[PDB]
Structures are given as C-alpha cells and as structure tokens.
From a paper:
The linear ubiquitin chain assembly complex (LUBAC) regulates immune signaling, and its function is regulated by the deubiquitinases OTULIN and CYLD, which associate with the catalytic subunit HOIP. We here show that CYLD interacts with HOIP via spermatogenesis-associated protein 2 (SPATA2). SPATA2 interacts with CYLD through its non-canonical PUB domain, which binds the catalytic CYLD USP domain in a CYLD B-box-dependent manner. SPATA2 also harbors a conserved PUB-interacting motif that selectively docks into the HOIP PUB domain.
A crystal structure of the SPATA2 PUB domain (aa 7–219) at 1.45 Å resolution revealed a fold most similar to that of the extended PUB domain in HOIP (root-mean-square deviation [RMSD] 2.4 Å) (Elliott et al., 2014) and the smaller PUB domain of PNGase (RMSD 3.2 Å) (Zhao et al., 2007). Species conservation of SPATA2 mapped onto the surface of the PUB domain reveals that while the PIM pocket is highly conserved, this interaction site is also very different from canonical PUB domains. The previously mapped PUB-PIM interactions include a conserved Asp-Leu/Met-Tyr (see below), in which Leu and Tyr occupy a deep, hydrophobic gorge on the PUB surface, the PIM pocket. In SPATA2, this pocket is significantly different from both HOIP as well as PNGase structures, and modeling of interactions with PIM peptides derived from OTULIN or p97 would generate steric clashes. Consistently, the SPATA2 PUB domain does not bind PIM peptides (see below), suggesting an interaction motif in CYLD may need to display distinct properties. Nonetheless, the high conservation in this area did suggest that this surface may mediate CYLD interactions, and single amino acid mutations in or near the SPATA2 PIM pocket interfered with CYLD binding. In particular, mutations in the “lower wall” of the SPATA2 PIM pocket (Y114A, T115N, and T115A) decreased CYLD interactions, while mutation of residues in the “upper wall” of the pocket (N98A and T94K) did not have strong effects on CYLD binding. The strongest effect on CYLD binding was observed when we mutated Tyr114, which points away from the PIM pocket, supporting that CYLD binds the SPATA2 PUB domain in a PIM-independent manner. Indeed, the CYLD USP domain (aa 583–956) and SPATA2 PUB domain (aa 1–241) formed an SEC-stable complex, confirming a direct interaction.
Numbering used by the authors: 5 to 25, 38 to 219
Write the structure that this text describes.
C-alpha cells in the first residue's frame, strides 16, 4: 500500500528539527517507515529513483557496493543539509564536485546523470557538466525534502545490507538482495526468510 503519511510527516519534521538544532534514533524510525504496513517498494521514494540508481551503480561502476552507495547517498545528504541550513553561504551556493572527496565517494559510485538528477532536485545545475551552482532563488522546502529522501536512501542501503547479512551463506549477490527488496513489501526478516527458503528450494 501507500507510505504512511502521518509517520513520514512526523519523521520529516523531526529530521529537519534535528539538523536545525547522532541520527541513529532517526535511522531507527526510518527503518520502521521503510517497511511499515507493507508499503510497496515503489512508494518508498518520490524524488529519487532509488532502486534504479542502485542497480545502475552495482551493474556499471565496478568499485561500487551497497556500502559504497551508502557513502554516496550520505555525502549528497550532507550537501542538501548544508544548503537548507546555510543557503546564503557562497560555499553552498557553489559546491565542490570535480576535486576532493566528492570524486572518491560520489563520482565513483553514481552515474553522472543520476548525480545531476539528484542535485537538480536541490536547485543545483551544472556548467560544462561541473561547477554545480544554485542559480535561482533557493527553495529550502524542496531541498529539505530531497535531503530527507537521501537520508531514507542511506537507511534503505542499511536495510539491504542487513537482509544480506541474514542470508549471507547462500551465495546471493547484492543485486539479488536489491531485487528481493524492490519486489517484495516484506520487512527485513521477511525478505531474508524468503531468500533463504528460495535457496533451500522451498519456494
């Protein structure tokens, strides 16, 4: 079914409040939201094409993994947080992407067009494919919303890492885990149980 709006709205408000004032308590809530009431996987995200970006990364970028994706989404989340907290600062109206840790964590892991799409939701557009800049007036609510989905994305990577750990002896790839998680609305233990049973031949 649909995502729980009340739970999501409450979590969003607490996420913004937290940053305006460790996010582990927020991550526990996010982990609950991502499986709550058997929300369909295709309703977990509305601004990022999460499972498509993940599968593109795992298939196309050889250094990647769910761990690497966690790091890329975390770095992009921090870009968003800085922008909605400090939109007047030159260092966040123009961001550093062609050199520095952004190369190692994001360019290594997400396709260029997915970087561009995610950054566009924050109002960043590039020049010559780089030099991302906020060229129109900031829309902090939109920045907050995509930052929040990058937070959910990093947590969802944590969920899929956990699914894999619970069925780690059966020879599955991370791509196999992603396909179960996007196909089934079960929680983490449900997904791992299904993967185990399938590997055992029990359907």
């Amino acid at each position: 079914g649909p995502m729980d709006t009340k739970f999501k709205d409450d979590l969003f408000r607490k996420y913004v409040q937290f940053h305006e004032s460790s996010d582990e308590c927020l991550r526990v809530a996010a982990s609950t939201l991502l499986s709550l009431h058997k929300v369909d996987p295709f309703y977990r995200f509305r601004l990022i094409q999460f499972y498509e970006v993940v599968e593109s990364s795992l298939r196309s970028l050889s250094s990647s993994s769910l761990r690497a994706l966690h790091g890329a989404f975390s770095m992009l989340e921090t870009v968003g947080i800085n922008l909605f907290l400090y939109p007047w600062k030159k260092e966040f109206r123009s961001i550093k992407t062609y050199t520095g840790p952004f190369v190692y964590y994001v360019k290594s892991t997400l396709l260029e067009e997915d970087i561009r799409a995610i950054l566009s939701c924050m109002g960043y557009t590039p020049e010559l494919g780089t030099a991302y800049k906020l060229r129109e007036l900031v829309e902090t609510l939109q920045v907050k919303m995509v930052s929040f989905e990058l937070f959910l994305a990093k947590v969802e990577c944590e969920q899929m890492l956990e699914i894999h750990s619970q069925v780690k002896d059966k020879g599955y790839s991370e791509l196999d885990i992603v396909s179960e998680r996007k196909s089934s609305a079960e929680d983490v233990r449900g997904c791992s149980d299904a993967l185990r049973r399938r590997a055992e031949g029990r359907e």
